[PDB]
Amino acid sequence: VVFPFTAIVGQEEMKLALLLNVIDPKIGGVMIMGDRGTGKSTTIRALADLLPIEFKMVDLLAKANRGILYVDEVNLLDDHLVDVLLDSAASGARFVLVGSGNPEEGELRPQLLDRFGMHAEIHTVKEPALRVQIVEQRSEFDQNPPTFLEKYNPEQTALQKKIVEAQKLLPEVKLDYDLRVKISEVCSELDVDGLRGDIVTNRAAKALTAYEGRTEVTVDDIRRVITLCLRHRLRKDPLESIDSGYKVEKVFARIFGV
Amino acid sequence: VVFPFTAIVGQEEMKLALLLNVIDPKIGGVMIMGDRGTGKSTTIRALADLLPSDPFKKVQMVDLPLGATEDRVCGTIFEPGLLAKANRGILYVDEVNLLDDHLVDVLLDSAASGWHPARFVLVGSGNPEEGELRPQLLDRFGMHAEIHTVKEPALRVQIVEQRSEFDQNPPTFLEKYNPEQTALQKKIVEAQKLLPEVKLDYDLRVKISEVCSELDVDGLRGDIVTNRAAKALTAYEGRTEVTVDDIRRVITLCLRHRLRKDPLESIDSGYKVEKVFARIFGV
Amino acid sequence: VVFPFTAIVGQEEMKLALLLNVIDPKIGGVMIMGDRGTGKSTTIRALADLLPEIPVVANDPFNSDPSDPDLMSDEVRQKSIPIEFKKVQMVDLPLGATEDRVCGTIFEPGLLAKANRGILYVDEVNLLDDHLVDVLLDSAASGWNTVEREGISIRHPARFVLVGSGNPEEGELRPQLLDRFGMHAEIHTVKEPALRVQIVEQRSEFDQNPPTFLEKYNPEQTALQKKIVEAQKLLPEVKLDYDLRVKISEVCSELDVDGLRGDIVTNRAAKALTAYEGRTEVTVDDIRRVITLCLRHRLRKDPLESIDSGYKVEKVFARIFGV
Amino acid sequence: VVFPFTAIVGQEEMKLALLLNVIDPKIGGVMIMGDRGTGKSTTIRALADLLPEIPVVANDPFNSDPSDPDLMSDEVRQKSIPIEFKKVQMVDLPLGATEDRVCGTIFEPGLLAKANRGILYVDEVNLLDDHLVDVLLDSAASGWNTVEREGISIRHPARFVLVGSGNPEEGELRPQLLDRFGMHAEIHTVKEPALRVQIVEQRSEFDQNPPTFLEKYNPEQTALQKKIVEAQKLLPEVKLDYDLRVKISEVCSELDVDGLRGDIVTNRAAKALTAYEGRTEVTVDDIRRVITLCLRHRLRKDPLESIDSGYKVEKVFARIFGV
């Protein structure tokens, strides 16, 4: 037995990315770097559950037609891994290319690092009140599993209903041409080395609206996903005075105005 | 069903070289150069559909993964190998530099030798930004193209929309793009027969040999491919002649990669060739 | 036929860690590194006698337990005889060994197969080849055997303690393997002349005639055999106050430590130490005797180590608690 | 027929540690390192002649002790008799031998099985192979061996002296195996023409006629052989006075020798040397002759400093005792 998806607290970057990937798998995969203790492998296994013939998870070549695939070892991979990711999003086995990375040791190669389309980072909690909450939850889980999940059972049905309703809202796009020109302009303003970025963000932010249930796409929607998919492609130079995400925010502000 | 070879926005450098190598099997391949993206792989797979031992069906494109050995490459036993599939087809090599072996040398040697006869094309790619190939092994390739990322808002949105369109309805689009594709196929079929009729003046041969000799280019490989490429281009334009202008359009990208590597200063690659061409010609 | 446990002179810190870990297997193992001599394993191999007893289903090569389906083997899960008194088994692997014995060979029983609910001892862990050491990282932290190859599949629970020793002036395992071991303790050399004379005389005396000497120490050691079973009974009665947890999670968070890996063990180590003493409540003193031992190899900082890690932990503890 | 022992000219220091090890088969081993030549490898192979007898049961590859019911290896423990006296054996392993015969694979007896309680000689231990050296790293100084190659996992007694030679120009020993040996003796070439003439003449004479050369020394060899047996029975009578045991321990403190192993071996050898002379009361100037050659290779020091590693031990000896 594993935690339900509504057990992780505070840290929420991966949730948005994984839920966006689940609704539409055309984006690709997600690359996450973080420590070996903060709980990267625990939260993902939760997402394996509560996933909506009569249909109702793979860990590292044929049984991948439905369901995500977790690698756990791609970071130290030297080569070949390119073959599996190319073959995945090439029709003749659609699945989510969720992956695990570490800030040190293997960092992959810029030739491959631009085949994924999503990237989020992990930061420390730095909160005594929250850490004791997590410790208490883990302890009461360890005391006995079965009664713990039943307590959090009610919200899982609501989450499933929301995901199912949002999945079938594909025609809701209403994406404005002027905003498409503006996003292409801001992306092309910095060095991106290809057209991989523009296609990913155009089909990502729109889908976020489908999560909420609205129809139109405004600046607020894009602002929350613009950094998350156009940061690791910004490998300008090792002279990193500040994190590239802040540079993305700077160019975002200088163009739209905020 | 795949993307047609007419909707690729811009990038006339790759298309011209690919067409020339298609209409002239003995040129010796291309080494498309550039950074990531910009449709290196889409164009190659878009070329295969646009196509109609010693003595016929539809052509097939053959590719191999980066991780391979002689178990599949050789195709040892009457088992036919991977190369024994393109008797009238094409073969693709990716990240050539990442393949540290003599297998790449074997493939180059198998070219221009129809004895198992294969007679395919040898498009090369990779090396976005990870060290140039060996100065010897790079000298057995016909022409060296180049790809650069488009820098403009008007096109950058359009291409994206175009791609999105192909995911709205992958079928029901070829008929919309049918008339453009058929025009190119008929033209290339016609041009494949007019080639053995071009005449090159002896006087221009002296001038082109002088142009080659003025540069400190080693060997004679720079004067066995240009003569064929100019004839192929002139035949492609549907004529039986050659002027000084046609050679100019297939000389910069045919001999650029044979130049001296020495970084004495920052002379541009094509600028030196253009300067020499202007110096020894009346253009 | 070996050196009795209650004959070691000095080296108190290692004994405390070993007994604390053997009280409750939810520890994560113990790491021992230090100079030659000083009886690194002279003590570890002496733990065969000082062990409790557990019930095991009869004629079970996998050493399963009554019920406990979560960790119940195949022959009791899908098929479902009486249990009997049995001893906790300690097994060790040599530095030079093949890979056939460690894993399965096809079902044959592997080295880990006859290691459940026991203690795994490795000697000179810094000299083992990387081929074998990459298999233990699979069975550990997963609690399940993996070998199912050769066309026929087989599953097997696997859980041990994995305590080991080594030498610090040759290498330190892998950067990631250090996090598998929950506890880490080091030994120095006692330089008091009287203690050295005492240990030399003790070793010489035992070297004369084994059976007469060991029996002399019988009255004391047996008492320990009837003092460690008390901790395993009073353990599920200790309680922690919110003021204690809010500080055990504050001291760790103040230092640049990996998230929720150091706080969990320190919350389960001191809480068990009282059971060894015999009380039912935890005081501030009990924190001081386990805080240094637990948060040592998690402390990742700059390569410069002019200060002492134990000194840093003690001073931050004093500053936070005001002691 | 090999060179007789009591004919080697000079080299008094090296010609005593071997006898000390022969008298008491528990101290450890003697590793001899010196310049090329000097006959390091001719004394060791000639030691087989001067050799006492020990009792060992009949029809047993392990050569177990008929008494001491705690040392029975495999089946005579279950059976718990043709007791016979026998000469102890000498077995040397070649440098170009694999691990098949060193440990044992099939249960056939390995090379280590054939050298129980005897003498194991290694030639040019400086090189070996850095891979086979690991299996014997822990088998010695433990008294037990375990083999698990295929289908057999049995505990195997193993004890020997592990004498070895070397050359200090092809590398240095690993700082872990260096502590298994007991004493370290250095060799310096002779520098007097008369002795060189003597050794050349004696070698030529032996090469002239092997058999008639032995009779010129046989009574001396018999006389030496009688002395070893007598000193092998009077050993458990000597006794170290308590003040001396405290005094010797303080020497190990000042030199900062890591590990409490130098103290044990230094004490053990002092008793044996006294039994060789015939007395039964150790005294100062009797351990003075056995300390400088036992606290030299265990002395970690500054990379360069300025000591031959020989003056410091005697300086501390003089400071402590006073001579």
Added chain:
Amino acid sequence: VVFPFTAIVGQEEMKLALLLNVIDPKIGGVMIMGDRGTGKSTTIRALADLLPEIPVVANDPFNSDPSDPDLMSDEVRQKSIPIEFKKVQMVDLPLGATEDRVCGTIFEPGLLAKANRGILYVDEVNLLDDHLVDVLLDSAASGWNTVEREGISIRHPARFVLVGSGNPEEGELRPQLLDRFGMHAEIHTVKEPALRVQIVEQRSEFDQNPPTFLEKYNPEQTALQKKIVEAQKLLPEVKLDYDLRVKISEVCSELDVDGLRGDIVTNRAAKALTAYEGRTEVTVDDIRRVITLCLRHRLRKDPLESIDSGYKVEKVFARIFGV
């Protein structure tokens, strides 16, 4: 279909070296070296067609002389006759070959057996090093190949011209393999604009139709492998004057080459060349035509000045000879 030899334009030096090596198959081969292009690997392939015929025994795994020697090689010695009068073959080895394949294993012949008394072509000799270059250091210059691998033990005759090429900007060879080569012919690319057009036209004409090209050159080329054969019969009739031989060694000693192999080669090459041109005598001109490109290969490396190769040899030859 291959490019006819007589159609190759230019390169009047390397053609001479190859032709002089074919007529007298004992000089020691050539080591053609130069920049890219210029057809270094075209002529070698072309020379296969223009080759003579030699007698050989049948059923023999490797070529051998029918009855000229006493056949001290293998069972042909005491078994002593089918002769097929076959043609000498061309054998080449790849850069990725392995040592066992070159010699043999459990008796399967290797590459050496095939390339005996023949032209063994080595591709890019500069890159190959260490492995599979030490075994070749005894098969040549001795005539006998010794194989003592995997128990199999025989003796193998072997001698070959060993024609090898390579690039001049990828390092230089070690001296041991450098002196096994007879001559050393350097290639320089044509630079006159009036000449390259001819090469381009000839290549284009050949590529248009490989047939109807040999007939355009068949009468001319068939007049080449008639002068060579006739030159072979005349060769064992030349008589170099004694006076010249004195002066030839003077150049060698004055230039201070290393060894003595630099004087046996020159005489044989001069005799073969003077037999090629038709006469049955030797003049000064014949020496000057081949001494330039024989000794230069063996000069001493010197980076202290800017003196090229061949220039010094010509200067010394002019100074010591007539004019």
Added chain:
Amino acid sequence: VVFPFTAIVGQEEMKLALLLNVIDPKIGGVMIMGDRGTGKSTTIRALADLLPEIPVVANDPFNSDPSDPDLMSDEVRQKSIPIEFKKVQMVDLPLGATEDRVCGTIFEPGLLAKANRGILYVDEVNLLDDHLVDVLLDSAASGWNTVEREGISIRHPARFVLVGSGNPEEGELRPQLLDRFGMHAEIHTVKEPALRVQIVEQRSEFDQNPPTFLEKYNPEQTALQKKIVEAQKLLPEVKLDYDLRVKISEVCSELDVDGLRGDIVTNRAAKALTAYEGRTEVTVDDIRRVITLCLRHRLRKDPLESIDSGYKVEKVFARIFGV
């Protein structure tokens, strides 16, 4: 079928050692280093057909000795028969021989056993791996083999001369193996033009016809066999008086030589030389001719100094010999 040994032009010093190593086959060996060419590997190979005869036991592969001490292997020693008077042999191992055909395993007779009381020619000894040179290190200078690799436990009586060649422009020998060689000789290229003319003519004439050359150089060779047979029996008659044996060792003491093996060889080589010129009394000029090449390499190089080895040895001779 091979080049005659007595027709070698010049190089007297190389001819001296290869004869002294056959008259009394108890010296360590020889080592000759020099430039390319100059026939280092031609003189050595010509020695095969000029050797004496010794008795052998039946057809044993180990080449035992019937009328000799207890050195007749182990299987023959059970007896203590037919006599054949065979001729000694020389066996050479290649540059890439596998471990199977050096120590021997299966009992398949190894290469060392088949080269007992013979000569082992190690060509190009400058290029040999760190392996295959240790298994050769113990068999020499000890005269007993020990193979314990694959289930076989056999001790072989092995003894050879260990003749090796090579050139010094590719590395330096290891310190241990550099001492097993007996005497070291140097080769320098000839410079007189007339000698070069003679040597070229000789080689060309020999190559012209393999036979009908022994028919010329027969009488000058058959006299050498009876020149060595007589000298092989007068050796155990010559005695060096005690006056000079004291002096020779002094020389070594002055040169700071390492070991006492560099002094035994000279006292034996000097006795061998005087038995070759007919005399039966060693005097000066019979040890002066051999002390130069038997002590040249057993000397500390000390690259700080800039004095050649040859001059230093002769400089100190007159210091104590008054010349």
